[PDB]
Amino acid sequence: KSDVFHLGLTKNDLQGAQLAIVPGDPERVEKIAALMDKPVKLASHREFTSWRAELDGKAVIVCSTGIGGPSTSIAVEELAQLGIRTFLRIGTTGAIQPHINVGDVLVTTASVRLDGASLHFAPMEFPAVADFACTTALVEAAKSIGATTHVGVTASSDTFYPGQERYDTYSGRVVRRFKGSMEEWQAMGVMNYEMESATLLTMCASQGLRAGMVAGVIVNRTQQEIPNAETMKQTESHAVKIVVEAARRLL
Amino acid sequence: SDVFHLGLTKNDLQGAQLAIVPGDPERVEKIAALMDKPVKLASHREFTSWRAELDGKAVIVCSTGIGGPSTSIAVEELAQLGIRTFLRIGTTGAIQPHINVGDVLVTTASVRLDGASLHFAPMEFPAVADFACTTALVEAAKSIGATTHVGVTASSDTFYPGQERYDTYSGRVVRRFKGSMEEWQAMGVMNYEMESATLLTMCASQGLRAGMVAGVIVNRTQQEIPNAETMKQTESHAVKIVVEAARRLL
Amino acid sequence: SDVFHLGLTKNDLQGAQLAIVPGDPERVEKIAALMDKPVKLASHREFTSWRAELDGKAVIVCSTGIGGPSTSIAVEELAQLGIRTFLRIGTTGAIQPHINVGDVLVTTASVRLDGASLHFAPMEFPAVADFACTTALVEAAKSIGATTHVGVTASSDTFYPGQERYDTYSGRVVRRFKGSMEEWQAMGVMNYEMESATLLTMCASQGLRAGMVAGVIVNRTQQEIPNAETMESHAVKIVVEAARRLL
Amino acid sequence: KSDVFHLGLTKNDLQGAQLAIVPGDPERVEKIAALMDKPVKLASHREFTSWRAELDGKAVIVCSTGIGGPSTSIAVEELAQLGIRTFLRIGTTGAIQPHINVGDVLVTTASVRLDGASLHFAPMEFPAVADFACTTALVEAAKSIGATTHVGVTASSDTFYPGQERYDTYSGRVVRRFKGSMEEWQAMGVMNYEMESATLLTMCASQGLRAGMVAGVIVNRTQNAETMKQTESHAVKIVVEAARRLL
Amino acid sequence: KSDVFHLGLTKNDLQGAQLAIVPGDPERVEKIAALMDKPVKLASHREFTSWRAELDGKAVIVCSTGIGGPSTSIAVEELAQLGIRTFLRIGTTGAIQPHINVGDVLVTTASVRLDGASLHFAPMEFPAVADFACTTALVEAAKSIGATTHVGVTASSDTFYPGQERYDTYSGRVVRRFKGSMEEWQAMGVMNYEMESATLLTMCASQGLRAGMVAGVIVNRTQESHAVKIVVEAARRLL
Amino acid sequence: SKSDVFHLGLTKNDLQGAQLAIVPGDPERVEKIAALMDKPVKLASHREFTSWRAELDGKAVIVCSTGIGGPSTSIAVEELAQLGIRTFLRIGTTGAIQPHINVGDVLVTTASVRLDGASLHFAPMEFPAVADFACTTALVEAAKSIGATTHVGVTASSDTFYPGQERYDTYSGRVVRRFKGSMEEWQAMGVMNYEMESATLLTMCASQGLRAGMVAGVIVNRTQQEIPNAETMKQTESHAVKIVVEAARRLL
Ligand SMILES: O=c1ccn2c(n1)O[C@H]1[C@H](O)[C@@H](CO)O[C@H]12
Ligand SMILES: O=c1ccn2c(n1)O[C@H]1[C@H](O)[C@@H](CO)O[C@H]12
Ligand SMILES: [K+]
Ligand SMILES: [K+]
Ligand SMILES: [K+]
């Protein structure tokens, strides 16, 4: 029994939930859901793992999107069908600005559309802009936690390699369009790359859905250290604490 | 004297770092008179500039004229003079049935139906407002009890075809814009105006802060032409909001 | 009155079918004063409009302000008012080493580096001047004896990055425009300005006649901004003589 | 532990393999592997589950891509880093031609690029084309198996909904560009919609890698479970047999 | 021998010519040349047939381009290599405005770039604009010949069928882009369709060569000798 | 004057039931391709469109030139399809851009980089300029039958011979921004060669239910110094022509 093609969920399964937290990794779903009351596994199909839970007496969904806009668009669409109206994406990310450290938290106001799925919802002229309420909740939750936060634009790429101008690859080549592109995003003040927000934010802002995006900085292109596992795990839980507190303000 | 178009010098600004940029040169005077020590600085072309003081802090008011090109000149030369924050105040025609004339719109980002924004960033880049600025605008409109709508604005290089107006000399709109208004409407776009895409883009991609607020004068979905007195209170209302917002950003 | 921006009525025009359209409102009166019976009409925003008379015919002078968007407003509403021929007089930056400040440039067509022209025709459509208007402009220029250059113009939505000026706040220009000036120059492009692409496209694609002429106030192969200070009535007298031939 | 960032694989894991079969669904990896000799699990991370097997004494990889071009581009790139030079996508699909029925097998010569990831590898003018040897192998194996086979173009979309012009959705609207697009693909002779091939074929064709695609039609858009299953098993047999001819 | 790859012409063959009249049809070259002094056949390769004649004691070239921008661009480049600096195209065309009649002469000021080759010389933003002295000579020649002449914008298409929105084809299909395009061109005041001017004009205007465009109307979509005489007389004025 | 089509000057009767056409660019090459077949006979010649009929294993086959470029290619293909042709085999010569490809080698195109304008008149840029599988198979097999050294892959199809193939030895010596550094990119992407008709041919056929294939003889290598004389070039041309005819046999 399922009301949607991919997620293997019913409207009944949601228990009146209208907000979902949407990480990329199916394995981070339970860990996120465990921070709320009465966490319970719902379904798991392909890259879509969903759990339901409770915040302040209200039902909340946690569901993975997988990597990239296409699978993200499927989860967002099918959750919307089942009644979700607010989406909070939590992620990890690599920063392209020197002044941003591993451990910091990024809140995305809007994304550069280096994806394709967003164009399936709005013409490129349309802004991949986050919901103001969502962004406010995220920024506020970050501050009441004491996290060092940066708010601004994020480049959202359909690839991990060429679209983020990595040259350490099989071909060692990046297509004309992306040559010298990172230095250009940096000069334009772009904070980071990730791979889902352009699709998420465009498809929501153009369909009367609310969307927010927050991420933990676990690496920095422009820095020379690495550094290590324990801070990456620590920062991750920061962002996770943050997205849950934000969700609390939006219920 | 220092910049080509505005005819202003670094000295004229008095260490001012924030600017309110209306479109109408004739509205500059008024906005500035709402603050302490209003003083006229210059007037060239569509650029009239005044200095004023807000909580003891120098602030500039400078008209942009209609459209991205002249806006982009005003902002650039002001940034050259030290301005880092820009708050646009304007008038708009709502295109959502639920938005009544006299409402206040705060723009988080704009649909880029202009050309000047492309001179700063490729189309993929979001014409997104600065968070602090948008927050200040929202909190000002609320503290003043204005019915506020917060969302996306379609920013057009034309008043007529780009906003799909057919009541014209030619009566035709180019293919790309045939059926575009209903599209924007279905997408939740609040309104049309003609500067924010250039503004938000050129600021967000150059390390400058920008926000925009506007008062609704018309509604492309309602039939009653607005009351000549409501439009006036609304404008002064949007103007009250932008001035209050600037205080938070000083 | 009859229109949303200009504050004009058909009556104000007095049967005028031609308009001279400069950018700066503060020189509308100065152009009007070259003709007979100049009378100010209106002034709202960047649109200052005057009426004059040339060889016993009514002529309008109305400023566009800087850029296609306000130009598109002026042109459209003037058209509603009955204007069918538009002659733009402007200032410009030369990108060819041999063009002197004070020279008169007549534009056959423009490189569309704007956005407003796209609101009238797809990019494939040429931003081309009306041939009668261009002939009148060239013929009038030959009458005056001005050092004149005829050809293509780059029309930009910005004064700075779109014309590849680097002396700016950021000192950077977006990828699209890096090394663009050199390319227009190699293509034989004469100059930069900010309104002709919009004007010529919206007119050529709506059955309206349009001409374009400008005085050089900077050579960009030398510097980004004029000194200047400076101090071309030549282009202005040419646009008036031209309008004379088109009445 | 790992030579790549996502797949969690080292070169040793491939045991010299140069060919990978790439399904989308991580849970179909075992079943495909199970058709070959000495099938063994390798790793599972995110949507990337990988198995190794053997075909006529040669090491073969099966690795899922997840849904869509972005994750696909990661799987292919990292596998290429591990030494894979030939990629065969196996899939399920919905036909958009009236003459293409469920149970049929489609071999894709090239794809309509309705995705974003292909552009990170080559400009839009570049063909998202399959490698000829792979296509030959897939076609010949299908003929060997007796499958009703269609060889041609496929539409590859970054979405399952608007990009395939579905309206039975939360918004009930499809963006301008995709309005009436299905009927156009149909009149152009396009066989089907799926979600990975544009990325897969473009990134391979522009990087000296071989790629091909076969899929089973389980559904027709213009108009049961057990016959859906029996079809997939046949398209799966097809890809495995084609793999043999490419080793 | 030849100094160029396709035309099979030598610089010597031009005898100093600096102006070319460029028809589309190779079979039309001889006819045009025979309206001038001392017409001599030069070469004939692929769709490029070239003659030399003499006009007012000046060497002039007549060279066919074939149909379409690509071969047109080959002929122009290779003629420019041989010293040609001025190109006048003479063509046939279908008018798309009710007021233009078959037998009328059209002079093109600029073209809608519905082609590909023009993009090999300038970005789409660049106008496919004709040279002013050439357009002037064509317009003044038209008066001399006594032809009903319209001056304005031409739609230059890479195809004869779908790009001119013809549906009477094998497929009966025209691609999204060109569905409803003819009516829009008409509403924009576009005069006619043809297939070479966008390329010709763009490549000349962006490379410092002079080009002009004139054509006889052979059909009107809403329902050649003059044009040839005009192009020859205009060539006189440009020597 | 008896033609069912606007340009070609051909009637259906002329085809005598033919359903396949060989479509070279050069009008002068039509006669010589038909000469590899039985009972060849000239049908017509108008503009750059010269056509012959001939027999292959007892079946009527058309040979018709397209002229240089997608526009006249698009006319020749459309009007022949009207006449009944359903399969098109283009044979050309080409300049290779890969060092490993030798002059005299033969290229079979699986799909083309669309550096043309005519293709867009049949399908948006997203659509692949891809060859029919049967035709490509026929050409590859035929290449083996003849014994040619064959490469199969992607071709760059450009609307110009000069700036679009990044040639600088020109009147202007200028190459527009889009094409600056393009040959090096195509090379890096594995593209085999440049030519000027295939993007149009392949797109219009693949998006209109027609079959099309592309084979070419390499008469020059852009990466190499030495340029072969007409003798070895004519020799190359012969091989490709033999291959297109042999390939046609398998498609009848
Ligand atoms: O380099 C120059 C010189 C003059 N102009 C210019 N660029 O653009 C034109 C603007 O409308 C206006 C802005 O200065 O004046 C024109
Ligand atoms: O509608 C028309 C009518 C005539 N022409 C045309 N389009 O294009 C020109 C081609 O060179 C050639 C193709 O028929 O003839 C010209
Ligand atoms: K995925
Ligand atoms: K203005
Ligand atoms: K040709």
PDB file of C-alpha atoms in Angstrom, chain E residues 116-187:
ATOM      1  CA  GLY E 116      23.908  28.992 -38.025  1.00  0.00           C
ATOM      2  CA  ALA E 117      26.845  30.363 -40.016  1.00  0.00           C
ATOM      3  CA  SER E 118      26.429  33.960 -38.829  1.00  0.00           C
ATOM      4  CA  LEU E 119      27.222  32.659 -35.337  1.00  0.00           C
ATOM      5  CA  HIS E 120      30.606  31.542 -36.622  1.00  0.00           C
ATOM      6  CA  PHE E 121      31.453  35.241 -37.107  1.00  0.00           C
ATOM      7  CA  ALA E 122      29.602  37.069 -34.348  1.00  0.00           C
ATOM      8  CA  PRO E 123      27.450  36.254 -31.315  1.00  0.00           C
ATOM      9  CA  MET E 124      23.681  36.438 -31.858  1.00  0.00           C
ATOM     10  CA  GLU E 125      23.563  39.941 -30.306  1.00  0.00           C
ATOM     11  CA  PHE E 126      25.460  41.277 -33.339  1.00  0.00           C
ATOM     12  CA  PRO E 127      23.239  42.725 -36.091  1.00  0.00           C
ATOM     13  CA  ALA E 128      23.155  41.065 -39.502  1.00  0.00           C
ATOM     14  CA  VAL E 129      23.263  44.565 -40.947  1.00  0.00           C
ATOM     15  CA  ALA E 130      24.003  45.542 -44.532  1.00  0.00           C
ATOM     16  CA  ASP E 131      26.656  48.093 -45.484  1.00  0.00           C
ATOM     17  CA  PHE E 132      25.269  51.630 -45.790  1.00  0.00           C
ATOM     18  CA  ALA E 133      26.989  52.541 -49.075  1.00  0.00           C
ATOM     19  CA  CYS E 134      25.847  49.234 -50.584  1.00  0.00           C
ATOM     20  CA  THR E 135      22.232  49.621 -49.463  1.00  0.00           C
ATOM     21  CA  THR E 136      22.269  53.182 -50.779  1.00  0.00           C
ATOM     22  CA  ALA E 137      23.626  52.106 -54.174  1.00  0.00           C
ATOM     23  CA  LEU E 138      20.964  49.379 -54.411  1.00  0.00           C
ATOM     24  CA  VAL E 139      18.165  51.790 -53.505  1.00  0.00           C
ATOM     25  CA  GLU E 140      19.407  54.423 -55.969  1.00  0.00           C
ATOM     26  CA  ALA E 141      19.854  51.798 -58.705  1.00  0.00           C
ATOM     27  CA  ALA E 142      16.288  50.625 -58.099  1.00  0.00           C
ATOM     28  CA  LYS E 143      15.052  54.114 -59.014  1.00  0.00           C
ATOM     29  CA  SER E 144      17.175  54.023 -62.169  1.00  0.00           C
ATOM     30  CA  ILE E 145      15.736  50.650 -63.228  1.00  0.00           C
ATOM     31  CA  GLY E 146      12.182  51.675 -62.348  1.00  0.00           C
ATOM     32  CA  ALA E 147      11.219  48.842 -60.024  1.00  0.00           C
ATOM     33  CA  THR E 148       8.654  48.802 -57.229  1.00  0.00           C
ATOM     34  CA  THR E 149      11.016  48.567 -54.277  1.00  0.00           C
ATOM     35  CA  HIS E 150      10.641  48.037 -50.536  1.00  0.00           C
ATOM     36  CA  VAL E 151      13.490  48.535 -48.091  1.00  0.00           C
ATOM     37  CA  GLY E 152      13.620  46.705 -44.776  1.00  0.00           C
ATOM     38  CA  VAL E 153      14.142  43.560 -42.726  1.00  0.00           C
ATOM     39  CA  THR E 154      14.540  40.036 -44.122  1.00  0.00           C
ATOM     40  CA  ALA E 155      14.162  36.652 -42.425  1.00  0.00           C
ATOM     41  CA  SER E 156      17.167  34.542 -43.408  1.00  0.00           C
ATOM     42  CA  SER E 157      16.485  30.871 -42.725  1.00  0.00           C
ATOM     43  CA  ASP E 158      18.782  27.840 -42.697  1.00  0.00           C
ATOM     44  CA  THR E 159      15.936  25.876 -44.265  1.00  0.00           C
ATOM     45  CA  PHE E 160      13.430  26.285 -47.100  1.00  0.00           C
ATOM     46  CA  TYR E 161      10.683  24.327 -45.334  1.00  0.00           C
ATOM     47  CA  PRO E 162      10.330  24.199 -41.509  1.00  0.00           C
ATOM     48  CA  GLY E 163      12.223  27.458 -40.895  1.00  0.00           C
ATOM     49  CA  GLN E 164       9.888  29.270 -43.274  1.00  0.00           C
ATOM     50  CA  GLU E 165       7.027  27.459 -41.535  1.00  0.00           C
ATOM     51  CA  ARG E 166       5.981  25.263 -44.463  1.00  0.00           C
ATOM     52  CA  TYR E 167       3.861  22.264 -43.420  1.00  0.00           C
ATOM     53  CA  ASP E 168       3.464  20.628 -46.843  1.00  0.00           C
ATOM     54  CA  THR E 169       6.407  18.320 -46.222  1.00  0.00           C
ATOM     55  CA  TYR E 170       7.152  14.636 -45.701  1.00  0.00           C
ATOM     56  CA  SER E 171       6.722  14.853 -41.929  1.00  0.00           C
ATOM     57  CA  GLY E 172       4.077  17.562 -41.925  1.00  0.00           C
ATOM     58  CA  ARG E 173       5.784  18.634 -38.709  1.00  0.00           C
ATOM     59  CA  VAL E 174       7.472  21.907 -37.774  1.00  0.00           C
ATOM     60  CA  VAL E 175       9.551  22.166 -34.604  1.00  0.00           C
ATOM     61  CA  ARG E 176       8.260  24.108 -31.595  1.00  0.00           C
ATOM     62  CA  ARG E 177      10.539  27.110 -32.261  1.00  0.00           C
ATOM     63  CA  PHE E 178       9.067  27.830 -35.685  1.00  0.00           C
ATOM     64  CA  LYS E 179       5.447  27.042 -34.887  1.00  0.00           C
ATOM     65  CA  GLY E 180       3.640  30.354 -35.333  1.00  0.00           C
ATOM     66  CA  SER E 181       6.839  32.094 -36.425  1.00  0.00           C
ATOM     67  CA  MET E 182       5.678  33.419 -39.805  1.00  0.00           C
ATOM     68  CA  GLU E 183       2.823  35.401 -38.235  1.00  0.00           C
ATOM     69  CA  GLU E 184       5.197  36.920 -35.701  1.00  0.00           C
ATOM     70  CA  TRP E 185       7.695  37.950 -38.400  1.00  0.00           C
ATOM     71  CA  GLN E 186       4.787  39.527 -40.302  1.00  0.00           C
ATOM     72  CA  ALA E 187       3.563  41.332 -37.182  1.00  0.00           C
TER      73      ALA E 187
END
